[PDB]
Structures are given as C-alpha cells and as structure tokens.
Subunit: 460 residues, 4 copies
C-alpha cells in the first residue's frame, strides 16, 4: 500500500494506540459498528471524505469501512490533522492525504488526490463533507462525477448554509443530509465540544491564566454558547456580542454582559465608531459566528496590548488577518502561535510590548492549537454521519429515473427516532439509566414507550 500521503508513517503505532482508546470512548459509533457489521449496509459504497483527519475521524472512517465502504480521505483544514491519526489510517490500507501544517496549495492537492485515483476520477458514489469545500469542487470542477453520487452528508453549520443556498438556486445536483442539525450533533458537538476544547486550545498555545481576565466572545449561537462557558468556567469575566436579540437574551440570562464592539452597535466603517474604551480592556477575543469580518481591522487596532485573538468558527475570515499580514510584523512563537507586532511591518523589537497573540493563524483554534472535540462528544456527530451515509446510500438517488430524482432532491435531517437512539448510546456510555414510560404514562403524554418523545418543533 502506497496510495496515501501523510507527515510520518512511523507515527502509526501511536495513532493505533489512541484509536483503540477512542473506540472505548465512542459507544454510539462502536454500537453501530457491531449492529451493522454482519449486514454490510455500505458494501459497494465509495465515499469521498473531507473532514479534519483526527483520531475521532479515524474511528468514523474505520466504522464506515467496517460496514463495507471504500473511502478516500483528506482533511478539511490545513491545521486540523493529527499526524498520528493520519498515519494509522494510512497504515490500515486506507487512502488518506492529510498532514498538520498544509499550505493552501497542498490543501487543494489533497482534496484532488481523493477525487482522482491513478490519474482518473474515482468512481465515487457518496460524499461526506465538513464546510462544503469538497462539495463545491465537485459541483464546479467535476459535475460528471455527481451523476454517479447518491448523496452528501454535511457535518457543520457553514456547510449546511452553503447546501441550502445551492438548493435555493437550483444548483445542488444530489440530495444531502444536514447532519449538523441532529440534536446529538448541534446541541452536543457545537456547544459542549467547544466548551471542552476552546480553553484547552488557548492553554496549549499560550499557557495563559484565564481566571480574572476579560474576554469578548463574538456570537452566541451553539458555538458561542459553549465557547463562553469554556471561558467563564475558568473564571474569565466574559462579555458577549450578538446580532440576534434572542441569542443576546440567552446570554443575559446566562449571566453575561452583552456589548457591541461598535458604539450603539453601529459599524459605520470609521474608527470613530469603535468602542475603544471597551476593546482596550479585552484580554481575549473569540469569534464564533460563521460570518465575515466580525473582528475587523479597527477592532484589532483598538484591542488591549497583548490580547489573544482567535477564531473557532469554520473559516478564518471571521478575523481580518489579511489586514494584519499587510501592516504588522508576525513573530512565530511556536507552530500555530504568532505575536503580531502593531509597531510596523518590516521589523519588531524582540522586547516590544505592543503586540497581539493570534492562534492558528485565525483558523479554527480548537483543532489548530489542540485536538478538537473529545472522542465521547464526536461519538454523537459521527454516529449521525454513519446513519446518514447508510440512509442516502440505501436510497440510491443516482440510479433513480429523472422524475423520482426531482422528488428526492432536498436537504433533510435524520428522523428524531435515530437522534434519540444515538443519544441513548451516549447516555449509557456515561452509565446513565433512562426511565421507561409505563403504558399509562405513554398514553398520558401521547407518545410511544419507544419514542419519539418530542414533537418535531421541540427545541431542547
């Protein structure tokens, strides 16, 4: 086996040891492996996969293969690969093209190495994506391959936003499952994953005390809620910015002061609109929005000296790092940790005090500066991915007549019953014991003893 490219194949034994541990941390995913192994529901599936090549993704990949699939894999971020995970996957005879610290050019080449096998397009028939970069490449550059592809399973909020836009414009060519919006994904991974991994990443990058310092978290969706808790539970004084008044209300009730970087919340593009007194007190800013330029150049100029700047949203353009590359000198402290010296572009005093610390060059910091979400959280997300792969592969969209295809071309979530069955394996993994409704109680609230227990409108 040579159909791979990783940083260091000799890291495979280490990766395998950590994969074995992760298996014990992922009962929902391992439960799927044991339940479906005999049936081989993914036999004949050929899955193009593009998502962070971590230990957790390793268990996902080996589950898909255990259920019958062939895959070709790449990471979806230049800094998120764990080289020991990539090595163990390569060592198991699975094509993987990923390493921590890719250039942008190498990132694209890796995705292309999955799309092409031995110089020609692979006969792929399934896609697993995180954020939609592979989805867009297939649509823009390889539309003929989409004729043979039965579906896409998309991991994350930004990827879903891009899928819905294509569907709205009539450009989506195969159906998709929104894996993000399973409750055992969005309200587990997006929130509690970041609760675990944001302070983890900041500590590994800087080793800064967080207790007693001032943080500003931009956004209070699922990622912003978990990120704010990551910081507050360490004793940070956290302020929260939001454009959505409902999410701002939740931030208030959770005990956070809600503030804007701009006077009266109005960004008129001028420096005069920056709340300089507020930003001058902030030791740490974290962007969580999935939006663009929410930590802009004027905010970066006004931040307190030596503030830490990081992003845990999907794409690095939440922060105007381009402005910083154009105007300020970058000092590498260590990989994925840069001091950005606001004193000039072409040099800096080694003992300068007017700098910012940028983590992961603005790429998602939990994966770039630590290891991302822990296995027992990714268990929920990735159990959903496997169910979504099984569901779309069994439907065989690519083999339907044109009229049948029109009826199935959608972006759907998994049924609530499967959401509950994933959650139950997660609960048992903690040693939790769910109560069984009596027949009288089940009649009283109008559900089956087996579930589902909530209407589809329920928000948890």
């Amino acid at each position: 086996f040579t159909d791979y490219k990783v940083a260091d194949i000799t890291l495979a034994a280490w990766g395998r040891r950590e994969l074995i541990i992760a298996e014990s941390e992922m009962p929902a995913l391992m439960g799927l492996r044991r339940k479906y192994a005999g049936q081989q529901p993914l036999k004949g599936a050929k899955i193009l996969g593009c998502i962070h090549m971590t230990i957790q993704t390793g268990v996902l990949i080996e589950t898909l293969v255990a259920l019958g699939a062939e895959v070709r894999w790449s990471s979806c971020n230049i800094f998120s690969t764990q080289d020991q995970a990539a090595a163990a996957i390569a060592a198991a005879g699975i094509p993987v093209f990923a390493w921590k610290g890719e250039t942008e050019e190498e990132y694209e080449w890796c995705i292309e190495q999955t799309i092409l096998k031995d110089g020609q397009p692979w006969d792929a028939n399934m896609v697993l994506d995180d954020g939609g970069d592979l989805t867009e490449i297939l649509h823009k550059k390889y539309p003929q391959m989409l004729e043979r592809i039965h579906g896409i399973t998309e991991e994350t909020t930004t990827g879903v936003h891009r899928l819905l836009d294509m569907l709205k414009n009539g450009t989506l060519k195969v159906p998709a499952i929104n894996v993000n919006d399973s409750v055992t994904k969005s309200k587990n991974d997006n929130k509690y994953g970041c609760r675990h991994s944001l302070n983890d990443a900041i500590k590994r990058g800087t080793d800064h005390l967080l207790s007693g310092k001032q943080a500003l978290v931009i956004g209070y969706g699922d990622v912003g809620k978990g990120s704010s808790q990551s910081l507050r539970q360490e004793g940070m004084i956290v302020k929260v910015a939001e454009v959505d008044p409902i999410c701002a209300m939740q931030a208030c009730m959770d005990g956070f002061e809600v503030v804007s970087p701009y006077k009266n919340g109005i960004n008129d593009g001028t420096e005069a609109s920056i709340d300089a007194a507020l930003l001058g007190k902030i030791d740490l800013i974290v962007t969580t929005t999935g939006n663009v330029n929410v930590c802009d150049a004027n905010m970066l100029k006004a931040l307190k000296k030596r503030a830490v700047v990081c992003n845990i949203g999907h794409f690095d353009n939440e922060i105007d790092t381009a402005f910083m590359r154009k105007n300020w000198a970058w000092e590498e402290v260590k990989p994925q940790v840069h001091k950005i010296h606001r004193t000039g572009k072409d040099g800096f005093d080694a003992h300068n005090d007017d700098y910012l610390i940028l983590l992961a060059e603005g790429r998602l910091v939990n994966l770039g500066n630590a290891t991302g979400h822990p296995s027992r959280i990714m268990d929920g997300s990735f159990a959903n991915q496997v169910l979504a792969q099984i569901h779309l592969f069994e439907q065989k969209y690519a083999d339907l007549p044109a009229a049948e295809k029109a009826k199935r071309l959608s972006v759907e979530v998994l049924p609530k019953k499967l959401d509950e069955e994933v959650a139950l394996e997660m609960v048992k993994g903690f040693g939790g014991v769910v109560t069984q409704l009596t027949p009288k109680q089940a009649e009283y609230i109008g559900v089956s003893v087996e579930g589902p227990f909530k209407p589809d409108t329920y928000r948890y």
Copy 2:
C-alpha cells in the same frame, strides 16, 4: 360603586399597587407594547376571559391589555398561586377578578364561572387567555355557544398546549389558538430561567433548609427540569436527573449531572422490588418537572430518605401520588403550604417522629405556591408574547369568518419569529445590552435582512 369581584382582602390594594409600579419598571417589553400601541387601541372591543395565576406580574399583563382597549374578567389558574395584594390592586382598579391564595377546589371552579358569567348570564366574551387549559375545556364542554363568538385562545404553558393539540387532532377545538409557550422568549426564558430563579426561592421560604451539600433528584430535564436542576446545583446541591427522553438525558450528562432512574434498569414493574431503594434512600429533595402523571409514585415515596422534601413544579399536582399519602399517612401542617407527612400511619403521630416527609404546596406547582413564581423581568417576555398573541387573534376576527374561511385558519400556531425577536430585543435593552447591527455585506453573507429574522424556523437556540 364597583363590587364585581371577590378577593381575600381589598385593603391590600395599596401595597399591591406599590408592587405593580415596581414591576412596570422590571417589564420593559410589556411596557414597550403599552407605549407603542396605546394610541391605536388594538384591543378596543376585546372582551377577554383570563385564567392565569393572579400575581403582580399578571397584574401588569392585565393592565396592559386594558390600556390597549380590552375589557377582562379574570381568575387564577391555581388554588395557591394568587398574590392577594395583586388581586386587591386589580379589583381596586375596577377590573373583575375572582381569586385568592388558598382556594378550595370548589372555590376554584366558582371563580372561573364568575369570569364566564356576568349577572348570571354568559358574558359577551370574544377572547380567551389561558394557562393549562382548564378554562378552555370548561368553555368547550359547558359553554359551546360562547365559543361561537370567541376569536381565539392564547395559551401560556406546555401542558395547555398539549391539551389544545389533542383537541385539534380530534377535531374538537372550536377556535384557533396561539401557542405562546413556544416563543423562544417564553419557553427558553420563562420555563427554564424562571424556575432557576424561583425553585430554590420557594424551597427556602417553605423550609429554610440549607441546600448546599445535600442530595436532590429532579424528575425530568425539559425546559423546567433544566432550570430546576440549575436552581439546585447553583446552591451546591448534588443533583441527579431522571428522564425518559434520551436526548434530554444526554444534555443532563453533558451539563454535569448523573442520570438515574427511580426504578432498577429504568423499568417500573409496579412492585416495590423494582424501586432503587438504595438510591432513593439517599435523596434529600425530589422535584417533579414533567407534565406527566405519577412520576413520583407511592413506592418511591415509601423509599425516600427520612425527612426528604417533596415538591412539584410541573403544571398539575398529580405528578406526585399525594392521594396515596392522604389515604395512608398523617399530615401535620407546619405552616401554610408546608406539611410534614408522617409515614408512621394515618391516624395521629408523635410530634417528635423522625419518619416523615415534607410536602410543599400540597403538590401544587411550588414556585407559585410557596413563593411568588417567576420574577417580573422574566415574565416580561412571556406576557409580551401574550399581548402580541391577543392582538394577533383579535385582529383576525375568526368568529366573524364564514364557515369555509374558519376552516382554513383553525389551528394552533406560534407567533412569527420576527415578533419573538422584537420581544427579546426589548428584554436585552432592559439589561443594558447592546446588540450589534449587521453591515449590509454581513447580512448578505449570511443571507438575512439587517432587521432580521436572523435564524431559520428550524433553529433550536
């Protein structure tokens, strides 16, 4: 000249008025609606039957409805939840209200009937505001001619919405309803944070027990169970959680709670042998939050640690098998809404007996029965939605639609997300919060208007 009311003590009106004036300053969303709509009188002609806890917070709601043009006739929806100074201030303002703390069940029914009837005949009501659905069911079973001229029902709480949806499914719901509970500024504000504030409040007022270091079991982890669990954990309780819904149980685990069942392997086989006696024998406090029936049952009550406190914060008291305790055990009133229940027998007890449980509010929802319910600034969200829902259904004029047009609007719906957001904005400004305004480029990048709504209807917050 006004006598069309019944309250505990009208002399409490001045105190109630003082507390209403304070609550106005804590309810910016509700008082914003009062300012915004007073000139146009959107509820002119509305005659609202209202049945919800006669608190200070409900008083501000009532006076907002009246300020916008409505007439009302009011009762409380629970026998223990009225604040007598609130009822007195409302009656003193010339508003028909029939409510006092400590009603009997017969007086509860009479009070609702006093709103329905005026001078012994059906009132010309045309709107209904309800909490839990008791008023709604009485109208459907006993006063169907009155429903002909009623334009809608606005329903406050999870249990009432369940009852409305069941009537709609069976085709017996006679007028459209707005599910006020499922505004995010209700369900994810009131149901959760209100119980966070008021559960430990009620337990302290009823018992003055230290909670730190003691063991609690919360039955349920929906919105009320989540807020209830935090109310106790933030005081230092060691909180375990029970759930039938594995997704909610997953949230409890991630939130740092041990998830347990009262029954071995979660299976209630009906016998004492299925009870986890070791677990229940360690619990100092059990709180029911489910909206379900008999989730703190006789066999659990028998197994609880001596001197444990038992209470319910769900809508109805049958969450706990209090009937079993009335039939079998000796009740000793400590003070109003606090009883020691002696497990040594039915007829009499030794005053120094150590084998008792403490029941709060006779199993009725404890935050309203033993304290004052949710605080004004939280009820601001729920009741701003109520006012918006009353305006919405009243303007639609369902009773005046022809039969074929009624058929297209007979539903149970929530308010538009834009209104939910506008309520939350006023709440946020009440805290001094400053929301950020999207730039045009950012609004285009995420595909929303700068004015909102900011999330798709599928968003769960």
Copy 3:
C-alpha cells in the same frame, strides 16, 4: 403563670415549636452536644445573659444551654432579626425572652435591660453570650459591678471580637472571652456559606427582582464578602468587588470577579468629583460586607443607577449612610423592611417617580431583616461552638479566682482545634459524609494523630 417575657404574639408558640423540632433535625452538632452532656449537666448553676438574633436557630441554642443545666435571660441583638414564632416558643417554654421583629431603638435598649434586671434588680448572672458586643459594652459601662460575678463572654461575630480585642488592648476588659467567630466551623462556615445561602434569599423576598444578567457591586471580600459575591454570581449576576485589602482583592480576581473602586483610582477625596460615576451608574445592586463605616457613602448613593437596590449584610447599618438619605430624600415604604428612597428631594414624592433607590431592612443586616438569616444546618456549627465555649469558661470559674490567677487567664481566646474538628465531624456526618481514618503509618508519615488535630495552628483552610 409565667409572665417574665415580652414577645409580639404568644399564640405563635405552636408554630415555633413545629419549626424548632425541624431545626433540631438540621443541627446534629448542637443536638449531639445536647445528648452527650445532658447527664453531666455541665452548665448547672450557669446564669447566662444572651443577646443574639431571636431566631429558630437561636431557639435551639437556648434550649441546648437549658438542657445542659443553664438558666438564661435573652434578647435579640438587632431590631429586625427576631422571628416572632421563635420568640413565642421560647417564652412558652418558661424562658425569659424580650424580643420581637420590628423593635424601635428604645425598645431594643429596653429589651437588653429586661435581661439584665430581674424584678428591678440586677440578675445574678455569671455568663454572657453576645453577638456584636452591645450587651458586653452595656455591662462594662453601666453595670460594672455585675461583671465581678461573671466568668466569661462568648462572642459570636467579627465585629464583636474587634470590640473585645480593643478592650483587652486598653485594659478595660473585665472578664475573659472566647472568640467564637474564629473557629473554622464558624468563620469559614457561617460567615461565608451562611451569607451565600441567605443574601440572595433576602433580596428575593424583599423585591422578587430577577438577579440574572444584572450588575452588582459587593463592597468587601472577607468571609462575608466572599459568600455574598457567590450568592449573587451563582444566580447569574455580573459581580464586581471592591476591597481595601490587596490579598482579599487578589482572591476576588482569581475567583473570577472584576475588582473596582467606587472612587477614581481608589482615592476618596470627599468630593463628588472623586466618585466613579460611570461605574456606579451601571450598578443595579450594592451590598456592603465590611464591618467598617460609611463604605457606601452619600456621594456613591447619589451616583447609583436609578432603581438600584441598596443593602448591608455587615453587622451595623452605618456601613451605608442612611442618615444622609433620611435627611435629604423621601422614603416610601413598600412593605416592612423595604423602602423606596426617592432622590427627587425631601418634602414629597410622586408615586410614579422613576428616580429612587430600594433600601432593604433600613440598612440593617439584610439576611436576617428581610429573610430568616442563616439556615439551621449552618448555624449548627456556630452554635455548637457557642455551647462548647460556654461550658469552657463556666468550668474555669474566673470570677472565683484570686487576683493573680485572674491576671493570667484574662484573655480573648479561640477554642482548641480539636474541638473545632469535632464540631465539623458532626456536621459532615449530617450530610452523610464519610471521613477516611488515617492508618497509623499515614498518621506517622504526616506527624499527626489518627484522632487529629490534623493541621498546625497556622493552617488557614
């Protein structure tokens, strides 16, 4: 016929007894002493002048002292802290007690005098139990002859100890004293966790304000300040802390609080220009915890955000300049111990004015004034220490010693650490907690006895 008492309403006795029976089950350290020493009667012959908040918890203390053989004559140490059902139950037990909630200052002084005098003549007291030093100073200044027959003072609280140490330093202390405050099972239990339980309790009872998301300023971060800040932070307040002690301020920072001063650069030059008006204009709640004077002064009160709540949980009301507010602003009573202070001037208020502050308990310690003080399970520690300190000083019989012997024993001392640990053990067993027993090898390895004491006297916990 027993008549040697004055309480608000003797008919509350039965309610008080019911709550005393409950509190006994919540105070295992105190009731452990009652059971261990009953046969020995170590306080036979003791005649105790007691002056401390006449609560249910103090009731259990009083009845413990009596059960161990003492006679007592009791008053409350604060005009607002008595629980009338507790005072009635004690009076109904034939115990002289002079206390009711809502005393005037003259009535407060008169009550202390009714304990000192029996049938118009000085009682033959030989022991003192005090909270804050008022009774101690009256005896020293007004009844010095009574001190010749007194064997010692046991003092509950930080402020009272400060006053005792000053008298010892100046040679005016006439009898030995035990500093009960500085047992760890007092200072690091009662002062901290008691306020944690009872500060947000009192604020909710007085105002029913939502605390979540609002801004608080706690003045001081000693034991009371630490517990008060946690009481508010755990409810979701955004808490800032002020301190003059940099070590305490360091703890506040590490605990996750912003440390700020009401004054620019922390310097109070007496002028309004030194007030940080922007800071105070955002504060919704200020709580004074210092035992110091005028830490919430007139210029701070002028600068506070409209409708801020103002309260004190330190020992005396002069932490807040309420004299300035009485002289310059108009007071509107909302209900007992809750006043709106209208900053619009003297000489009349508009009932709908928005420019007021809310003052709780007229500046007196708010946990006892607007709620019920610390819960029984916390006061268990403080009051087991009191019982042990009374036994200790009474057995020493200072008043009977020759002058050279008295000279050597005239001091202000804390109880031995071994007793402190023995109180804590009973508290821990009350929670079901299980301490581990050191093996002899482990005890040898750290240089302690298996029995304890486990820490050197320098240890700070």
Copy 4:
C-alpha cells in the same frame, strides 16, 4: 565558550527566550521587584543553589535573582517537570543549569550534584532555594560543611516545609528557612488556583478525555485538593471528595461535593473486603492531592472501574502505590507520560484488553508532567515571595553570626504580612484591579494603617 550546563537540546533556546519574554509580561510582581531593586543589587554576592521545576516560570525567577546580583546553579526538582526550551534558554544565557524532561532517577541525583559541585569541588554556595526538600536533605546528610556558609533556605512547597519543621523540632536543621508556601499569595493562590488551571489541562493533554458527565474521586481537600476539585467540577465532572480532616471535609460538603471514603465506613481493615468496591467501580478518574503516603493503594487500584484514569498532583509519586502496579501489571506506553496498565497480568497484554487503567506521569505530579504546571500569572505570586525571601535571609547573613546569635535566629518562618500584601497588590494591578484606599476615619475605625497590614496574623482569608 560556556559549557557548565546539561540540557536536552540547546537549540531550543530561541523558542525558550520567546516564551520567557511573554512570561515577563504575565509576571508583574516579579518584574516589579526586578525594577524596584535592580539599582540596589540586594543579592550581590549571593550564590544560590536552586532546585525547582525548570519551567519558563522558573526561568523568569532565575533571571530576576540574577538581575538583582545573584549567581545561581540550578536543577529541576522532578524528573518530568522541566520544559526543555526553558532550560536551553537559561543555559544559553550563561547560567549553570542541569535539567531535562524525562530524567532517570539516577540522572535526577546527578543533576543536583552538578549544582552542588563546581569543577569537582563544593561550590561557594551561600543560599538555597528548594521545592520539596531533596536538595536540603542532601546538603544536611552529605555536605554539612557547605551549610556552615549558607545563610538560609527558602522552601516553596507544603511537603518541603513539613520536612523543614521536622528537622527543626529534632535539632537537625542547620540554617534558618523561610516558609514561602504559607504566604497567602502562595498557598491560597498557587496551591489552589494553580491546580484549578493546570489539572484539567494535564488530563486533557494526556488523554483528551471528555470530563463532563464523568465521575471523579479527589483524595484530599486542602489547598491542592480544593483547586483540583474545582478544576474537574468546572468541566462538568461529578466530583466526590475524600478527606481525613473533618474541617476540610465540611468545606467540601458546603462547596457542593459528596464526601466519601475508598474504605467502608472510612476504615481500612488491611484486606480487600474493606474497599468500597461499589464506589470505586463507578469512578472514571482519581486524583491524589494529599502529600501523604499510599492514599490510592493496591486494593483501591484493583477495584477501580475499568479504563479509569489515575493521577497524582501532590509532591511525591508515593501517594499512589505504583510500585504494586510495576510488580504485578503490564505497562503499555501510549505516549510519553501516558501508560495503560493492564490488570490482566505482568507478562504481556492483549492490545484490545478492556481491563486497564491509565496512569499519567507515572504518578509524578501530573500538572507539570503532562502539561506545563501553573501559569505564569499565578507563579508570579509564588516567585515574588521567593525573591523577597532570598533577599531577607541573604541580608540577615546567618552564616556570619556568632554561635550565640545563630541560636536566636534558627527558625522556619513566613514573610511578614506587609510583604504578602505588597505582592498581592501587584498581582491585582496586573488584572487591572483597583483597590480602594481607606480614609483616615475608616482606618482608625478598624484599627489599621491606611498602608496596611489590614488583617491580624490570625486571619485565615
């Protein structure tokens, strides 16, 4: 041509220097001392033997000592705690340092001897800075003539102070010592909040285990156990606490933890039958914090839930019986300082065995072994005390005193509270905190100087 050092890799120096420059901005009390005393050179002529974790933070300490005039010879006090880039940067600045991460025990001892000897003979040392007492012991046992010229020891940690006080009580301590550990800005900053920061940090780096919703048992609840319990509880762990000291156990209860013992009724009867197997079979993580011996013993390790993590954050690895595991069970290295310990036998294992434990840092203190120890801004307090303590003892010149003068000064003492407050003030200012200044009237009222000290020496904070 500087060669008087031994480190892992000198080419890591530039990276170490970058992190030192950052750490200087995180250590304002230490850099304040540098600026205050540089001109005075108070440590001119000082020659310090240093033995403490060769971290970035120790690097800032070393460079402060040198900047005040000292020469040093340095080693790490633990085989796994050195940060190799820190050591390289110190060596690159021309400072003798003998330290690398992953020393053998033999190399550990050789490194200490390289500080003691220079070119084969005793260095002309005259000061000692130590953590845990290994260097102090070696000097007393093997180099008594060197102690003749040494003016003092400054000891960092609880375990080292315990060893100093035993030598003092036995007459074998040869030079005076400063207990740096018991400054409040050390013990109640470093010991507590340092572990709060770095314990969950080390566990995440070693295992990347989710902690939320899992079960932990923290052995001990002193300063380290308090900070460790919070480290885990704040992550959502369900934390149980063990203690032999009932006062610390009481604090754990009040802080909201269940207090349990690994042994039934807390009593070890010398057999497996006294292990609470039901309790330990539920524990996912056990952390020892005691400074005691064998508090996680062989029978406890046999009973732990499969796949539980085992670690120690006390000073020495013998808190856990790792010797039993080396003798009986098969060790599989996951990665450096992370081992799976297969309870299925000593001779080999199945790679997919489920019956293993995970041991971090081979039982050596886990925050330093699997992460980077405490953060700079916390070590600021500890190491500012170290500098002040070195200055104080060096200026006293004990070695030069006549025998009868030595006798009056041979002691183990803490720094004065005034210095403790001055360190804290610089820490507070580092956070942007603003302490209030007492007015003259307020200072008189509480009996302190406006400058401080603000508390009596008995105060426990």
